[PDB]
């Protein structure tokens, strides 16, 4: 229903049709993506992932910029600038930021006016302005058609958060710090390649870099009532795709065991935190969750407490797959969040309605 | 002593630099670099290596404008213009453009066109560059030759003894392949690479491809063309690669006979250039070692005495530099142009 | 219906297990299996795989003695001696020995001793077995071989096409090599193993070696021996591997000439067995894939119409099992015993 | 000074052997190992390492029992049971428990039996008597020839202790944990194959092994002053031989930054932890920790605190090489901590030590 597309083409640009096409409830539909590499690539790209396997889908090569997806077609863009991208002509209600360079809704805005009704932010954008959008926490608490460029915090936190959310929610926690296992990726070069950062410079899949996580702050960004109580380090580690943190947390509460909280997990995971929060029982590893979309994988057993209160709290998780499911999260939400129907103002009383047309009304020059 | 700059300066250049230092009496006074990267980085680029570990040499930068290595001041320019890089403030003798993007003489000339005077590249010089490799073409290289290049490490590495290959027995046909490592040139993570193979992430997948080894083979040795031509395999490894070649030699023989015929090669020519043995060694047991490879004399098996296996963990990285650093010294030597 | 237990519940154990679920029409009533490893481990091990992922097949079992999965409740014990491994308690139909440690017919005898009826070995049995392999030794195969073997995936995969090539074009000489993965056959660490190379860790190092391929080719192909000889290259990968062979074929031909020929074969017979294409696909593109290997069409060069490189990503583990599964059910059929 | 053997050819045995031959002034001298694998193999193995490469010193293979360590003719055995292997015939002062097989001192007792006058345990504790001994921590606290079957725990503890010990000593540890991604080894499975720990039963450098480690609490076994404050799991992962932990525990003192404590750690790393720790502010990764002579190494730059109390201790270490020095650290300490046949203070002459040395009776040594 909702007109969708992707800014650029990434592995997350590779991520979601796997979900989306594999999805069964997606109202919206992508119709185009900026693969500046050709469908042949894009297909070979999208049809064949590196981790989740070949796309189990007849995503086929109709015309070099308009291919097929098991019969459903989708156009392709090939460019690295919003302004030429005719999201207007494309009518795209919702586009996914795939440059990263848009750490700013502004640059994403360069598509909004270009006919992006709304813009799917994907990563932690250095532009703070956008309300910090995270499922289980603030997902609904987002305001539809209010600054339609829609944030999406780091999977690491974005997965950690609902869990990280439930804990203090279950407990109340003085504060917290942690370290995930940031899988090896491209951002850190396979080679010791010239980098704006010493860390991701190095040859990737051998060295293991601890690094910066505003995602830690992003907790406060999504858990304002939990502001400041957050910390941790971004340990870039050599895996294909799974990260997992144990979170050091001085729990504000008594200091009862975790299994209780894990029962509360077993409550809340089975509660709203389905889809994201799993507490499996068999102690299992990265593979055991690949292609599995339970966007958080806690181990009750492995998780421990120190003083009963300082809880050593772990959770396996992928870094893009679950993240790719965060796509659908607001997607179907923002879809129903989309008005569709009309408004009930009074262009006499709410002459702003009349002014929405008659914007050059002295009757309307508010704050200006 | 030879004022040198390095464009696209990288690992192999860093290697060349770790070579340069290891090259005690390095007649290349490489006081200049081109590298768009940051200095401390560029330091760590040389300072902190993965494969050979950090550069066993401390790096000091005063304060950010210049960095001095082993008590010698060094510079690193950074501008994507193939000329603006000031190779003239010194009037650079030798330039090494790592980027390889100027497979045409031009960019290298463009490097020469503001002070630089000589060139070698990791990229095989397509056409307008002498097919110049140690063991094979560094000699016929007259120092008047200014802008040359090296072809693939593979090409670079195989060159000397594969020349010696057809020497001792003659080769009916030859189809070579490498256990080429993984690099960032192939998409280390899935990105827009022309080669769909080299396009994925594939930290554990191989890349069918070919190389100037399949091409300069003629350019380095005339008959060695087509029948003497193979492919390349970029494999999930970081390090010293191996030659996956079976030479259909002309003269009937058995394996060690050719290895006997190639003991001498190390004993006379491959010395420093290449090596050979049969003690089982692996890429790390080839690390930072300048003899471009050791041939698996044992498993370089003979089959029909014509189609003969050739197998050698070859230094795709360090010897590659070394050989070029050797070639650099060669051009550091005979200095007229 | 085939009351079967396999020895050595390795990956291939899980594979065929998964294949049991994967392959349809399984008379292979393999209600038992052997691996001296812990069974509940093995269960979870069966339950949880890395490559083809956990075998999501939920299994409910009451008591250590009885285990049930996907309806087909399946026993399994852990022991070394096939005589200490009772088979007559089920009157075992077939065994395959994934351990490899029973690489002679006696263990099968010892398996036949405790009440087994038929045996085959995925691994090439040392000595006292005429192996059976589809495409090569499944035609003259007799179900009346209570003890037989398969060869390594390498042979188990490299066989048919080149035989058919030998059928359709012949080969003067063949130089076969693989990208043979790593396994328990080699030491994770540099642990003490007979083969120094297999002893080493080699997390990123290959093993220059030779599996039974260039040897089992003798059995499976009474023609192609000596002339048609290469070696193995046991690589530091866990997964689907690639063939790497250059042949000196007999009849004059060129690349595509064999391809459609190689195509048509799979278009009828190597269907399921093997494959061929030229769409660049990397390892990940071959998870749980059964057509043992698609051969590259481009890089499969042809020199002098005899010197012909060949290349194909092959499933050393699952497609091997597939092939292992292939005749396995066949001997279940024609169930003379 | 001290003829030394090992429980088989431990990997770290080879590691320390590389050290041993390159070791400065080892009073002790290893002259035999157990290779039930062929000397040439073990030699090659000893010669050719993967991690630090082959030896830059040609050990030469004299006979299948005794090769020559660049001339130094060192023997070997071929077994896993000492009781038939008389280090007595070898006069081996100390056999080293390079495996863990005889996880029990009594198991190692078979070797004091088999001709050892002392024994070094390359293992954390299993029973009680374990001579829990961390150089820097409690090195000097060894009673001369007290419990000749002497214990060196894994760096998981061995490296782990001193700064931690120092940390409380410097800042006051209340309760908490560290955790490292630990290297891959054979103690975890190559691939998915038989092992009790499902985790250590899998393919490791392609996964993570979040698993219990009493070492995380065995620090009390050398720092009992800090008993009850300890937790932590390791994570065997794609690293050859290196790790780095972060003891994030609520600290007793104020809650100031770490760097300050790390400035004193900069003192301590040069102080009691000289040749042991290294507070290297340069953000450096595993490769930058090869040949980790220093038993530990710290990055203050990233070392920090969340609420001050918990300490984001950024500090690294090799897991075997450094340990292979802790081998010598303890060992040549014990060389001092055990004057062997060099007995310049006999007292077994006109003083009662004679009969004890001679033979116990209702005599000089008519003990309890
Ligand atoms: N997955 C996470 O949790 C997370 C968090 C923060 C940031 N990120 C980054 O944001 C991106 C999202 O992941 P991904 O699956 O898309 O992998 P990805 O790295 O392939 O996505 C971005 C890539 O798309 C391409 N790109 C950028 N702009 C483009 C344009 N105009 N046209 C065509 N291509 C363009 C580039 O290759 C870029 O590297 C990644 O760069 C990821 O590294 C991811
Ligand atoms: N002067 C200021 O600092 C400032 C700045 C921002 C807003 N405002 C408030 O908002 C309005 C803008 O103020 P201003 O400083 O720009 O002076 P202004 O009010 O003169 O700017 C608007 C002028 O442009 C024309 N105009 C109005 N709407 C137009 C439209 N759609 N298209 C073309 N022309 C249009 C009119 O001639 C008008 O005089 C004012 O009503 C003011 O009250 C003032
Ligand atoms: N080592 C080999 O065997 C081999 C063989 C053939 C080609 N190559 C190429 O050479 C590189 C490896 O050599 P290396 O270890 O010295 O490192 P390197 O990667 O830094 O050398 C070349 C690099 O220069 C970079 N570049 C482009 N413009 C640049 C600029 N203004 N300034 C600085 N760099 C710029 C390119 O990205 C290129 O990858 C790889 O890029 C590889 O693709 C290597
Ligand atoms: N293509 C080849 O080269 C080839 C062919 C056949 C077998 N093999 C070997 O056999 C295995 C085949 O692949 P896989 O997925 O099954 O891996 P795998 O190693 O897990 O299979 C071997 C299994 O046998 C078990 N084992 C060892 N000794 C045993 C004994 N006395 N009794 C019962 N079980 C015993 C092992 O624990 C293991 O589970 C590999 O270990 C491989 O090394 C290799
Ligand atoms: N890497 C270290 O610093 C270290 C030190 C002590 C213990 N450990 C742990 O315990 C194991 C041993 O330590 P390592 O580092 O030397 O690796 P390792 O496993 O290679 O050391 C044991 C080696 O000695 C031999 N061995 C094993 N058991 C034996 C026995 N009963 N008798 C004779 N020889 C035997 C084998 O060759 C084995 O490789 C390791 O697997 C590791 O998990 C590690």
Residues D239, D286 contacting (CB under 8 angstroms): yes
Name the closest ligand to CA D50. Answer: 5
Asked if the structure places residue D95 within a domain, the reply is: yes
Residue A311: which H helix or E strand, with range? strand A310-316
Q: Which of C11, B7, A62 is closest to D194 using CA atoms? A: C11
Q: Cα separations (Å) of A349 from A343, A346, A363?
A: 14, 5, 11
N-terminal to C-terminal alpha carbon distance within chain B:
14
- Kindly tell me the sign of the dihedral angle through the C-alpha atoms of A349, A350, A352, A356: negative
Q: How many domains does chain A have?
A: 2
CB contact under 8 A, A190 and B190: no
Q: Least CB-CB distance to D50: which of B49, B50, B284?
A: B284
Q: Cα separations (Å) of D69 from A285, C168, D13, D73?
A: 43, 58, 14, 6
Residues A340 and A227 placed together within one structural domain of the fold: no
Q: Where residue D331 sits, what CATH number does that domain have?
A: 3.40.50.720
- Token pair, residue A258, equals 């975790």
Residues C297, B223 contacting (CB under 8 angstroms): no
Asked if the structure places residue D365 within a domain, the reply is: no
Rounded Cα distance between D162 and D138, Å, is 9
- Token pair, residue B183, equals 């690099």
Rounded Cα distance between C156 and C152, Å, is 6
Give distance in angstroms: CA of B308 to centre of ligand 2: 86
Residues D1 and D139 placed together within one structural domain of the fold: yes
Q: How far is A219 from chain D (nearest CA, A)?
A: 14
Residue B72: which H helix or E strand, with range? strand B72-74
Q: Where residue A294 sits, what CATH number does that domain have?
A: 3.30.360.10
Residues D118 and D228 placed together within one structural domain of the fold: no
Residues with Cβ < 8 Å from C43, sequence gap 6 or more? C59, C61, C67, C76
Residues A238 and A208 placed together within one structural domain of the fold: yes
Rounded Cα distance between A113 and A23, Å, is 29
Asked if the structure places residue D366 within a domain, the reply is: no
- Token pair, residue D233, equals 């799991």
Residues D296 and D333 placed together within one structural domain of the fold: no
- Token pair, residue D24, equals 């400065």
Length of chain C counted residue by residue: 337
> What beta strand segments (E) does A61-150 contain?
66-69, 72-75, 94-96, 118-120, 149-150
Residues C266, C328 contacting (CB under 8 angstroms): no
Report the interhelical angle of C318-332 vs C11-22 (nearest 10°): 60
CB contact under 8 A, D194 and C41: yes
Q: Cα separations (Å) of A153 from A134, A217, B162, D148?
A: 7, 10, 56, 57
Question: Can you tell me whether residue C95 is helix, strand or coil?
Answer: strand
Q: How far is CA B132 from the centre of its chain?
A: 11
CB contact under 8 A, D312 and A283: no
Residues A171 and A287 placed together within one structural domain of the fold: yes
Give distance in angstroms: CA of A276 to centre of ligand 1: 22
Rounded Cα distance between A355 and A362, Å, is 9
User: Which of the 8 DSSP states describes residue A182?
Assistant: B
What CATH architecture does domain B2-151+317-336 belong to?
3-Layer(aba) Sandwich (3.40)
Report the interhelical angle of B318-332 vs B11-22 (nearest 10°): 60
Query: Any idea of the CA torsion for D250, D209, C235, C132, to the nearest 10 degrees?
Result: 180
Report the interhelical angle of B153-168 vs B212-220 (nearest 10°): 50
Rounded Cα distance between D260 and A151, Å, is 38
Name the closest ligand to CA D83. Answer: 5
Q: Which of D66, B53, D65, D46 is closest to D57 using CA atoms? A: D46
Residue B47: which H helix or E strand, with range? helix B39-47
Mutation for D interface: B18, B40, B49, B50, most D CBs within 10 A: B50
- Token pair, residue A107, equals 């640059």
Asked if the structure places residue D91 within a domain, the reply is: yes
Residues A109 and A8 placed together within one structural domain of the fold: yes
Q: Count CB neighbours of D342 within 10 A.
A: 11
Range of the domain at D103: 1-153+320-354
Q: Count CB neighbours of C326 within 10 A.
A: 22
Give the burial string for A62-82 (b: 16+ CB within 10 Å, else e): eeeeebbbeebebbbbbeeeb
Residues B29, B3 contacting (CB under 8 angstroms): yes
Residue B314: which H helix or E strand, with range? strand B312-314
Residues A223 and A99 placed together within one structural domain of the fold: no
Ligand 2, atom 9, lies closest to the CA of: A368
Residues A111 and A160 placed together within one structural domain of the fold: no
Strands D94-97 and D118-122: parallel
Residues C147, C129 contacting (CB under 8 angstroms): yes
Q: Cα separations (Å) of D324 from D13, D107, D154?
A: 7, 22, 10
Q: Count CB neighbours of D225 within 10 A.
A: 12
Place of tokens 């929060």: A277
- Kindly tell me the sign of the dihedral angle through the C-alpha atoms of D347, D351, D353, D355: positive
Phi, psi of C53 (to 5 degrees): 70, 170
Residues D26, D328 contacting (CB under 8 angstroms): yes
Rounded Cα distance between B263 and B298, Å, is 13
Biggest alpha carbon–alpha carbon distance for chain D:
68
Sheet containing A149-150: give its strands across: A29-33, A3-6, A94-96, A118-120, A149-150
- Kindly tell me the sign of the dihedral angle through the C-alpha atoms of C80, C83, C85, C87: positive
Q: Least CB-CB distance to B177: which of C210, C244, C282?
A: C244
Rounded Cα distance between B89 and B66, Å, is 15
Asked if the structure places residue D109 within a domain, the reply is: yes
- Token pair, residue B320, equals 């590659």
The answer to whether C173 faces chain B, any CB pair under 8 Å, is yes
**Within 13 A of C121's CA, how many CA atoms are on the CB side?**
27
Which parts of D196-257 fold into alpha helices (H)?
215-218
Asked if the structure places residue D71 within a domain, the reply is: yes
Q: Cα separations (Å) of C238 from C192, C293, D96?
A: 20, 17, 34
Contacts of B283 in chain A (CB under 8 A): none
Q: How far is CA B66 from the centre of its chain?
A: 28
Residues A205, B203 contacting (CB under 8 angstroms): yes
CATH superfamily of this structure's domain B152-316: Dihydrodipicolinate Reductase; domain 2 (3.30.360.10)
Residues D220 and D260 placed together within one structural domain of the fold: yes
Report the interhelical angle of D258-270 vs D161-170 (nearest 10°): 120
Rounded Cα distance between A314 and A246, Å, is 4
Mutation for A interface: D285, D302, D303, most A CBs within 10 A: D285
Rounded Cα distance between C277 and C297, Å, is 6
Residues D95 and D163 placed together within one structural domain of the fold: no
Q: Cα separations (Å) of A131 from A146, A308, A332?
A: 10, 35, 18
Residues D193 and D137 placed together within one structural domain of the fold: no
- Token pair, residue D8, equals 């088989």
Strand partners, B174: B228, B247
- Using a CB–CB cut-off of 8 Å, the residues of D that contact A are 174-177, 179, 181, 198-199, 202, 206-211, 229-233, 235, 237-239, 244, 246, 248-250, 283, 285-288, 302, 304, 306-307, 309-310, 312, 314
Over the Cα atoms of chain A, what is R_g? 22
Residues D98, D12 contacting (CB under 8 angstroms): yes
- Using a CB–CB cut-off of 8 Å, the residues of D that contact C are 9, 11, 35-38, 41-42, 44-45, 48-50, 184-186, 189-196, 198, 201-207, 240
Q: Which of B240, B209, B232 is closest to B317 using CA atoms? A: B240
Residue D120: which H helix or E strand, with range? strand D118-122
> What beta strand segments (E) does C127-267 contain?
171-178, 207-209, 232-234, 241-249
Question: What residues does each domain of chain C span?
Answer: 2-151+317-336, 152-316
Which parts of D253-317 fold into alpha helices (H)?
258-270
Question: Can you tell me whether residue B283 is helix, strand or coil?
Answer: helix
Strands D297-298 and D315-317: antiparallel
- Token pair, residue B44, equals 């760590």
Residues B205, C282 contacting (CB under 8 angstroms): yes
Q: Cα separations (Å) of B65 from A25, B38, B73, B262, D316?
A: 58, 10, 11, 50, 32
Residues with Cβ < 8 Å from B66, sequence gap 6 or more? B73, B74, B75
Phi, psi of B288 (to 5 degrees): 55, 15
Phi, psi of D58 (to 5 degrees): -75, 95
Give the burial string for D239-249 (b: 16+ CB within 10 Å, else e): bbbbbbbbbbb
Asked if the structure places residue A141 within a domain, the reply is: yes
- Token pair, residue A324, equals 């790719």
Report the interhelical angle of D39-47 vs D11-22 (nearest 10°): 60
Helices (H) then strands (E): counts for chain A? 9, 15
Resolution (A): 7.1
Report the interhelical angle of B255-268 vs B153-168 (nearest 10°): 110
Rounded Cα distance between A311 and A167, Å, is 10
Phi, psi of C326 (to 5 degrees): -55, -65
> What beta strand segments (E) does A172-262 contain?
173-179, 209-211, 234-236, 245-251
Rounded Cα distance between C280 and B190, Å, is 14
Strand partners, B178: B243
Residue B234: which H helix or E strand, with range? strand B232-234
Q: How far is D337 from chain C (nearest CA, A)?
A: 33
Residue A200: which H helix or E strand, with range? helix A198-201
3-state secondary structure D137-206: CCHHHCCCCCCCEEEECCCCCCCCHHHHHHHHHHCCEEEEECCEEECCCCCCCCCCCCCCCCHHHCCCCC
Angle at A156 between CA A153 and CA A157, to 5 degrees: 55
- Consult the annotation and say whether D155 binds a ligand: yes
Phi, psi of B228 (to 5 degrees): -100, 80
- Kindly tell me the sign of the dihedral angle through the C-alpha atoms of A278, A281, A287, A291: negative
Angle at A196 between CA A199 and CA B45, to 5 degrees: 65
- Kindly tell me the sign of the dihedral angle through the C-alpha atoms of A335, A217, D284, D155: negative
Rounded Cα distance between A71 and A59, Å, is 7
């Amino acid at each position: 229903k909702l007109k969708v597309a992707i800014n650029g083409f990434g592995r997350i640009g590779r991520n979601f049709l796997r979900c989306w096409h594999g999805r069964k409830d997606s109202p919206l539909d992508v119709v185009v993506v900026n693969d500046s590499g050709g469908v042949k690539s894009a297909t070979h790209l999208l049809k064949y992932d590196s981790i989740l396997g070949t796309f189990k889908a007849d995503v086929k090569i109709i015309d070099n910029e308009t291919f097929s997806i098991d019969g459903k077609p989708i156009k392709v863009v090939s460019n690295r600038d919003p302004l030429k991208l005719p999201w207007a002509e494309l009518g795209i209600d919702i586009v996914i930021e795939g440059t990263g360079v848009f750490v700013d809704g502004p640059g994403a805005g360069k598509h909004i006016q270009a006919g992006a009704k709304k813009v799917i932010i994907t990563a932690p954008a250095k532009g703070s302005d956008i309300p910090t959008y995270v499922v289980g926490v603030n997902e609904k608490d987002y305001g539809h058609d209010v600054a339609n460029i829609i944030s999406n915090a780091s999977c690491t936190t974005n997965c950690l958060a609902p869990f990280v959310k439930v804990l203090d929610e279950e407990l109340g926690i003085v504060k917290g710090t942690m370290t995930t296992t940031h899988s090896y990726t491209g951002d850190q070069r396979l080679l010791d390649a010239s980098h704006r950062d010493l860390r991701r410079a190095r040859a990737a899949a051998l060295n293991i870099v601890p690094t910066s996580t505003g995602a830690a702050k992003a907790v406060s960004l999504v858990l304002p009532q939990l502001k400041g109580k957050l910390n941790g380090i971004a340990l870039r580690v050599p895996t294909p795709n799974v990260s997992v943190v144990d979170l050091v947390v001085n729990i504000e509460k008594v200091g009862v065991t975790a299994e209780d909280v894990n029962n509360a997990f077993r409550k809340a995971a089975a509660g709203p935190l389905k889809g994201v929060l799993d507490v499996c029982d068999i102690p299992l590893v990265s593979v055991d969750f690949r292609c599995s979309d339970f966007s958080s994988t806690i181990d009750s057993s492995l998780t421990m407490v120190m003083g009963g209160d300082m809880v050593k709290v772990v959770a396996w998780y992928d870094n893009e797959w679950g993240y790719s499911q965060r796509v659908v999260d607001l997607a179907d939400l923002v879809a129903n969040k989309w008005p569709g129907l009309e408004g009930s103002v009074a262009s006499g009383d709410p002459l702003e309605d009349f002014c929405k047309d008659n914007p050059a009304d002295e009757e309307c020059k508010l704050y200006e | 002593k030879l004022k040198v700059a390095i464009n696209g300066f990288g690992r192999i250049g860093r290697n060349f630099l770790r070579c340069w230092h290891g090259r005690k009496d390095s007649p290349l006074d490489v006081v200049v670099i081109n590298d768009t990267g940051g200095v401390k980085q560029a330091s760590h680029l040389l300072k902190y290596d993965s494969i050979l570990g950090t550069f066993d040499a401390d790096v000091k930068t005063a304060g950010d404008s210049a960095i001095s290595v082993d008590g010698k001041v060094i510079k690193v320019v950074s501008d994507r213009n193939p000329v603006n890089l000031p190779w003239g403030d010194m009037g650079i003798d030798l330039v090494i453009e790592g980027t390889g993007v100027f497979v045409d003489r031009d960019g290298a000339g463009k490097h020469l066109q503001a002070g630089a005077k000589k060139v070698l590249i990791t990229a095989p010089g397509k056409g307008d560059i002498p097919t110049y490799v140690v063991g094979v073409n560094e000699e016929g290289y007259t120092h008047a030759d200014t802008i040359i290049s090296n072809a693939s490490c593979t090409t670079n590495c195989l060159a000397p003894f594969v020349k010696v290959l057809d020497q001792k027995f003659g080769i009916i046909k030859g189809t070579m392949t490498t256990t080429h490592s993984y690099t960032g040139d192939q998409r280390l993570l899935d990105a827009s690479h022309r080669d769909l193979r080299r396009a994925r992430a594939a930290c554990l997948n191989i890349v069918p491809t070919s190389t100037g080894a399949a091409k300069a083979v003629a350019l380095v040795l005339p008959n060695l063309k087509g029948k003497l031509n193979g492919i390349a395999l970029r494999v999930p490894t970081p390090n010293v690669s191996v030659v996956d070649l079976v030479v259909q030699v002309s003269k009937k023989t058995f394996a060690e006979e050719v290895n006997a015929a190639f003991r001498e090669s190390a004993d006379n020519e491959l010395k420093g250039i290449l090596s050979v043995c049969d003690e089982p060694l692996v890429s790390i047991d080839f690390r930072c070692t300048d003899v471009s490879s050791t041939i698996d004399s044992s498993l370089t098996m003979v089959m029909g005495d014509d189609m003969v296996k050739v197998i050698a963990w070859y230094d795709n990285e360090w010897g590659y530099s070394q050989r070029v650093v050797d070639l650099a010294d060669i051009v550091a030597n005979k200095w007229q142009a």
